Design a protein around this ligand. Structure first.
Ligand code: TPP
Ligand code: TPP
Ligand code: CA
Ligand code: CA
Lengths: 807, 807
């Protein structure tokens, strides 16, 4: 569970001291100086004579525009943290403001504690400026290499989904979430505002949304800066917020007047947030209007108003660098010098290059610091879940009645197990769902918890399994559900979410950014401790989207995840729950895992159980296993064909084909694949089957019929350098299907049992079996015609039960 | 359950027809005519010449002031019921407006269907005017003898508690509840207004409170008529009502315009109530402001404006009769004649004496009639409870280890039993409690239902066992709990309420009124089918109010109920649950019971269990038993003294005395009274023990030591004519006690085991035993001193178990 840090939700009960504001104004000046430093200077950080074009970087990389606004807010938030003792994480939406985030960590001391080479003197300062967005150095964004970051802000949109995920089950946590006014135009951001109806002010922390209304994005004004102020205020009132607006920097008002006005506005906002938290201890079923701050300042604030007779301060022109070169002419270098000199660094550093005591006296200490708070390194908070005994959830009937028994909905088993994990790990585990938790059969969790809902209630006849507090959250937004969970994990908790397989593609780009976050962490951030995995139940999959049709038929997230499977990062898991027992073995491995995205493809549709839990754990350990109890061949040499499957439905059809092939006395080895990456080149993936183990399972020389859940391309790409790879006949999804029957779905994708049988016969001897083949092909048309005439599948398809069952 | 009658919550969707409103004014006129007739005329209803002073009544008995106003309202309600098809019960707050309710029943034709002797002609009018409030006739109030009444309104103040009880689990029922402005000054009424936070507009019906603001009570203006209209409006709004005011009859405005205005306002109020009922099918968690009608009309409306130079219309002087006598002078007869003529009775009756057809054409028919509605005759709705199996609740351990076993809280047993009653009779059974349901140990109910609460919710940390709908209701008003349950039974449902014994006295007057309702019903109202019994758990009793003290120590309710045990009405049960097993037997008896007020005196303290369920049934069947197993005497001749207890605690002390009498070789009978009315004079009660059965149990010649739960005066008055009654030595509560120990409570009322032992010896041989008697007296003064010194009771009192226990 999240730790209670400092003295939360405390009013100052006194005006902000003048000496604190002089601190903030000094922070701002030194942060802006460090920020311009990182962008423009390779050397001479303090402009010791001689200071020349030689000291300026050859390529200017990084963003000024957003930065001075961020520096202003973080200065004021640091003052606020020290005065109040408030557990604070910032979300930097404008992640391209990376200079503001590195400057923060430097100034609060966490940069030097984390990277000892980066000292507090002229030497460290030189290295600090140079290394920014520099080969062999650190990124342009508020990346995971930055202490204080749980949000890089590279792909804009997720500032609010992450803020709200961070405060869930974290009642002492305050999150200023700084939202770009351009970011506000993305879809993900636009729905994120609505998150204030899915958090409770007693059991969760508090998000303060801050609209960085600097008027501009890259090359355009922003919608929200160019609509009437009355429309802007209404918009945020209508999303359940109390909008405050701060305007500064558009006139000659002196900086200390600005700090006084801001510090007083912030404390008035803070006082309302404390009354919300005090009220929540008595009444947490009435949703308050949560403050938010419209922060309207000029983009590029404090840079030169004009450069080359073009407007730069208060323009889109300041977004990257207001001055495109400092090397090209004397005059341009002069501009950089007067700009850097405008902050008066001579008042900010002592002789040996360190920031003066009186610049940092107001700052917070120890774990309250932005860069040192454990919420911003949630692995140090993360505990192992108390897991219940896996054996308690096993489908025992496989052992009694034998392989292929029953018509169980596999995902109900993961539902029972996940229920009891929530029972034993209250406040540490959450399920998210895009209005699909029940549809994906995880509703067993409602036995120990509720859907968290902090909008209106109306009736017990409709409002089932809802409470203002609960470990399940649903909104119809893959972006919200991915976003919430990501931040929950990054702040040291655990969970899972489910989606219909086709609509996983809505958050492909979020999976990408989270993969990339994890790739960077395992590679080069050993201080950033492991977080619980992002566990995604991919269900209501293509083969059984026969009730919804072509729109809902796309297993392609497999292809997308395969694009994050390099360099032995081991940050991606792709699992095919063959059955309920294999789903348990995968759930066990995923729930115990850290630093991964786990895709678990599992049918929710009635299907057979093939494996005992013991057999499934043994198979999962390797990723693929021969099924000796289903093989007719006793060794590889005897085997005329290999029948391999990956997925509940490809396994059903391959297992049905095996039975028809066994009636013709064919010698065939059956193979199951639960771990896609177990098939990956041994050269790329040191956890994959060895080429000797691969050859053992799939044989060295025989024809392999491979029925795959997703697109054949997936497998054909993975096994390019595997032994016997040219003898893989890989059938998968083929962009065929509609509103039809389960049999038609596999038929039309040439993965139905009758086709898989015919293909095996073709691969053994098309001549010897030309007749049986022809008969199979005629049966396929017969079986379709049956569906069209009757409106359900032929009973040969429907009523089949593995020969190996005793009924 | 309560039946769905007519087309409930229907909008009219058109103006009221002129024809309908002509109807209502005729109704008003004829009902004013029938009402003055009942008060003043013994003969010659239609004033056929000669009409003289000899057609008047000698004694003028009945109330006018309220009646014209009631007649106006009832008329307009009948128009409403007929146009809409609305399930409707009225509550006549000013029950002294009896003439209005009888007038109603005659006109709707339920009077002639119930009393075929009272026909629709001059002959029937003559019987009808005579019979009213007249020897060997019918009462002055809206008594139970009147179809449409479930509320006499003799004892003012219960109008709203009855209205709100009536609507509970009755979603089709509409209850216009007419409240006197004088009734409003009473406590029970003043608190009754708040019942709108304890009812739900989906699962319960609607009460429309109508304040009959006629300006006056008997001799005084009413407070609510002489405060500003602004305060009046704010008052009702503050109590969660939408107040509507109708002012009429204080100017020369024509009757037909008054009708037009009123019907408009009525249909506007009805449209609101329909919108409330429609909304509630979707949102029944948000409490609406319920409409209420301030009806401001002159008291005595349509009486002479003056009589003998005294203001009568719009004055307290019309309260009874504005015409003090119609026989004292001729002038006074003229005033009566003129008054009766101003309704133009020749337009209302045909020369036959039938009320014409144009007068009733507008009226409701069938079961929608105020008279015919089954909710006003609840017995016709009353089903038997599906009762669970009494054996399933038995304390089995008395068989195992013998009489006197355990320290169980008896009320917990009653509570598990009643829990299962609710579970099996959903929407048919209710528990009421004045914030004492848990304190009296009846909270097992919370397993299957909740406390009904329709004010605000705030937190799951305080709002336990509470839903907007449930079968348990709690307010800190004994008047509300008693009132709600009364109306719940009258409308043909079942329930129980519990109270601290002392505080049952708050509602003595309501026990009186309901007993009298039941007395009259069983005597001469066979058409009024039998209603479920008013079952009252009387716990937290005098002996174990050692924690609260003197104020909480009053078992008087027994004394009060005995004053309603006559004529073999059998409308009062007074039971003492000896233990949990006696309580189950007493409970089943009460829950199957009808047309009774059952008072069940049972302790909630840890006590011994004396009887199996079979010994309990047996003992309860007759209402007293000899405990063979307890007696040392094997017959009545051998016995030296009879020990008798009524009540758990007297039973304990008597049984402990019995063990000290046993260890001195004394021979004694042990008797237990469970049903107090079994000791009643067999002259007075044909269910009481016969003088033979009595003398058998209590011997005919032996001295009887009687430990009585309550005041000794009770038993001393009940047995005045019983065998061996002068030999009864009755110890009971004697207004001694404080905040003290359990022993000191019995000690200071001379009913402790040591005094009971001493008295048994004093009644055998004051002299032979003067050494044991003196020693017992010295231990009483020595165990009290132990308790003062150590603050718990002497181990001899505390650790005692009956002889006949243990493995
Ligand atoms: C999803 C996405 N689309 C496009 C971009 C490219 N992009 C990066 S910064 C930016 C403008 C952002 O402006 P705003 O949020 O207003 O930031 P600020 O003014 O604070 O720099 C754009 C289009 C992106 N990073 N992410
Ligand atoms: C508790 C109680 N106290 C006193 C009375 C005696 N009583 C009968 S009528 C009456 C006045 C009632 O006036 P209101 O309710 O305003 O009746 P209305 O004006 O409709 O005649 C009184 C004091 C009573 N019935 N009940
Ligand atoms: Ca911007
Ligand atoms: Ca009155």
């Amino acid at each position: 569970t999240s730790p209670v840090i400092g003295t939360p939700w405390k009013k100052l009960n006194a005006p902000v001291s003048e000496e604190a504001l002089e601190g903030v104004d000094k922070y701002w000046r030194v942060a802006n100086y460090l920020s311009i430093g990182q962008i423009y200077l390779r050397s001479n950080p303090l402009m010791k004579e001689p200071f020349t074009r030689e000291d300026v970087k050859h390529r200017l990389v990084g963003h000024w525009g957003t930065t001075p606004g961020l520096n202003f807010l973080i200065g004021h938030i640091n003052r606020f943290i020290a005065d109040h003792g408030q557990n604070t994480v910032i979300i930097m939406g404008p992640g391209h403001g990376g200079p503001a985030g590195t400057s923060q960590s430097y100034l609060d001391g966490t940069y030097t504690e984390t990277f000892p080479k980066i000292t507090k003197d002229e030497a460290g300062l030189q290295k600090f400026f140079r290394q920014f967005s520099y080969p062999g150095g650190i990124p342009s964004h508020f990346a995971p290499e930055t202490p204080g970051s749980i949000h890089e802000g590279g792909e804009l949109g997720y500032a609010l989904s992450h803020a709200y995920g961070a405060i869930m089950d974290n009642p002492s946590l305050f999150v200023p979430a700084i939202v770009g006014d351009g970011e506000a135009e993305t879809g993900p951001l636009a729905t994120g505002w609505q998150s204030n109806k899915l958090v409770n002010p007693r059991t969760d922390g508090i998000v303060l949304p801050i609209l960085h209304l600097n008027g501009y994005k890259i090359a355009n004004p922003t919608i929200l800066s160019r609509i009437s102020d009355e429309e802007l205020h209404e918009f945020f009132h209508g999303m359940g917020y109390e909008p405050y607006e701060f305007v500064a920097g558009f006139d000659d008002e002196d900086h200390m007047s600005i700090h006084r006005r801001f510090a007083e506005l912030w404390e008035t906002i803070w006082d309302e947030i404390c009354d919300i938290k005090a009220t929540a201890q008595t009444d947490n079923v009435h949703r308050p209007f949560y403050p938010m701050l419209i922060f309207r300042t000029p983009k590029g604030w404090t840079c030169p108003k004009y450069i080359d007779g073009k407007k730069t301060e208060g323009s889109w022109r300041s977004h990257q660098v207001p001055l495109a070169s400092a090397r090209d002419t004397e005059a341009h270098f002069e501009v950089l010098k007067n700009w850097l000199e405008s902050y008066k660094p001579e008042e900010l550093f002592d002789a040996n290059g360190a920031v003066k005591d009186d610049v940092l006296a107001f700052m917070p200490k120890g774990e309250l610091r932005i860069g040192a708070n454990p919420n911003a390194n949630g692995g140090v908070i993360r505990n192992d879940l108390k897991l219940p005994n896996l054996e308690d959830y096993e489908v025992k009937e496989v052992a009694e009645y034998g392989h292929g028994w029953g018509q169980l909905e596999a995902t109900r088993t993961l539902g029972a197990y996940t229920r009891d994990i929530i029972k034993n790990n209250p406040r540490d585990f959450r399920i998210f769902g895009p209005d699909e938790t029940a549809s994906n059969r995880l509703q067993a969790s409602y036995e120990v918890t509720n859907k968290q809902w902090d909008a209106g209630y109306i009736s017990d006849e409709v409002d089932e399994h809802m409470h203002v507090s609960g470990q399940v959250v649903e909104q119809l937004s893959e972006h919200q559900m991915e976003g919430f969970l990501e931040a929950y994990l990054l702040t040291g908790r655990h969970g899972i979410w489910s989606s219909y397989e086709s609509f996983v593609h809505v958050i492909d780009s979020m999976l990408n950014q989270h993969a990339k976050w994890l790739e960077a962490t395992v590679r080069e951030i050993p201080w950033r401790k492991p977080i619980a995995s992002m566990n995604l139940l991919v269900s209501s999959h293509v083969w059984r989207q026969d009730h919804n049709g072509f729109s809902h038929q796309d297993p392609g997230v497999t292809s997308v995840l395969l694009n994050k499977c390099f360099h032995n990062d081991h940050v991606i898991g792709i699992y095919f729950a063959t059955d309920a027992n294999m789903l348990l073995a995968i759930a066990e491995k995923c729930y115990k895992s850290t630093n991964k995205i786990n895709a678990i493809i599992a049918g929710k549709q009635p299907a057979a159980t093939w494996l005992t839990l013991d057999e499934a754990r043994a198979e999962l350990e390797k990723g693929a296993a021969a099924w000796d109890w289903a093989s007719t061949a006793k060794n590889n040499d005897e085997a005329e064909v290999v029948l391999a499957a990956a997925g509940d439905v490809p396994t059903q059809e391959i297992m049905a084909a095996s039975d028809k092939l066994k009636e013709l006395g064919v010698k065939f080895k059956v193979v199951n694949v639960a771990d896609l990456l177990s098939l990956q080149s041994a050269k790329e993936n040191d956890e994959a089957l060895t080429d000797e183990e691969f050859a053992d399972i799939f044989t060295a020389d025989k024809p392999v019929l491979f029925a795959y859940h997703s697109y054949a391309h997936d497998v054909r790409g993975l096994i390019y350098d595997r032994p016997n790879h040219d003898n893989f006949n890989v059938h998968g999804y083929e962009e065929e299907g509609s509103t039809t029957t389960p049999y038609d779905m596999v038929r039309v994708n040439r993965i139905d049992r009758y086709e898989l049988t015919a293909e095996a016969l073709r691969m053994i001897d098309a001549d010897k079996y030309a007749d049986k083949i022809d008969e199979l092909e005629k049966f396929r048309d017969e079986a379709f015609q049956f569906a069209v005439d009757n409106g359900y599948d032929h009973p040969d398809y429907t009523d089949w039960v593995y020969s190996g069952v005793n009924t």
